[PDB]
Design a protein around this ligand. Structure first.
Ligand SMILES: NS(=O)(=O)c1cccs1
Ligand SMILES: NS(=O)(=O)c1cccs1
Ligand SMILES: [Zn+2]
Length: 258
């Protein structure tokens, strides 16, 4: 016990330990596609994951993280709305108990079955732990998942999940290529916001891709077999680990495309 997604420690409770839950730049938000302004001055996003080095995959009791070696400039995000260079540290997903829900961002109130977060930290702050303390410390690239055809490049991730079923298990996870998770287009919306889990730090430039990837019902079924609890504790399925949309307040969502 600590924060979680249940009725007693879920998102509606987070504020009591992390008062910034109710701040002015919280995530996720609903993306009102008609209100987002086209911005012709935005650069194309630059995703260079050519030399990415995955190390490990971890169940942390909230989701699973695939972690990358971020000790050199190997997998970087740049361009788009970003000044400077951000390094890939980890990716994880948020998903639902049913296909009808699971994403954190919504697009005109539409919920996707899941959402991928590729998390990068601003190289000028030297590490992740320092970047999160800064208003432009992180750039998270969000990609929606819908259920239809399998994504072949996600299969290696779904196959290792049996080995990390419960909170705290980890496993070796080398030579995973994150480029196999990206849709065709790099069209995106961008707005300033926060971590979507405690400590909810307001340190993120959110880059949310317009085009979802499609994954198979069998692939997302396997996410749903993971556990929130630790090994030899009562079984709580890891499902519905998403924060709902937070008020937009004084913020504009820009679009890279018309
Ligand atoms: N605010 S909280 O979700 O971190 C919490 C911890 C214990 C009960 S509720
Ligand atoms: N879900 S998220 O991408 O906003 C995040 C939380 C903590 C590190 S990255
Ligand atoms: Zn996330």
């Amino acid at each position: 016990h600590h924060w979680g997604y249940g009725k007693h420690n879920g998102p509606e409770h987070w504020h009591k330990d992390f008062p910034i839950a109710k701040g002015e730049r919280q995530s996720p938000v609903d993306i009102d596609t008609h209100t987002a302004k086209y911005d012709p001055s935005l650069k194309p996003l630059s995703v260079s994951y050519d030399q990415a080095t995955s190390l490990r995959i971890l169940n942390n009791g909230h989701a699973f993280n695939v972690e990358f070696d971020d000790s050199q400039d190997k997998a970087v995000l740049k361009g788009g709305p970003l000044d400077g260079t951000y390094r890939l540290i980890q990716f994880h997903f948020h998903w639902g108990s049913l296909d009808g829900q699971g994403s954190e961002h919504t697009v005109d109130k539409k919920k996707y079955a899941a959402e991928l977060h590729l998390v990068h930290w601003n190289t000028k702050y030297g590490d992740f732990g320092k970047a999160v303390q800064q208003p432009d410390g992180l750039a998270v690239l969000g990609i929606f998942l819908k259920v239809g055809s399998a994504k072949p490049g996600l299969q290696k991730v779904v196959d290792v999940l049996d080995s990390i079923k419960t909170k705290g298990k980890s496993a070796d996870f080398t030579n995973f290529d994150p480029r196999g998770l990206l849709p065709e287009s790099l069209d995106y919306w961008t707005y300033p916001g926060s971590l979507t889990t405690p400590p909810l730090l307001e340190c993120v430039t959110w880059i949310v891709l317009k085009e979802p990837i499609s994954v198979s019902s069998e692939q997302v079924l396997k996410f749903r077999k993971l556990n929130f609890n630790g090994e030899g504790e009562p079984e709580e399925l890891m499902v519905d680990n998403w924060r709902p949309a937070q008020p937009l307040k004084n913020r504009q969502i820009k679009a890279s495309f018309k």
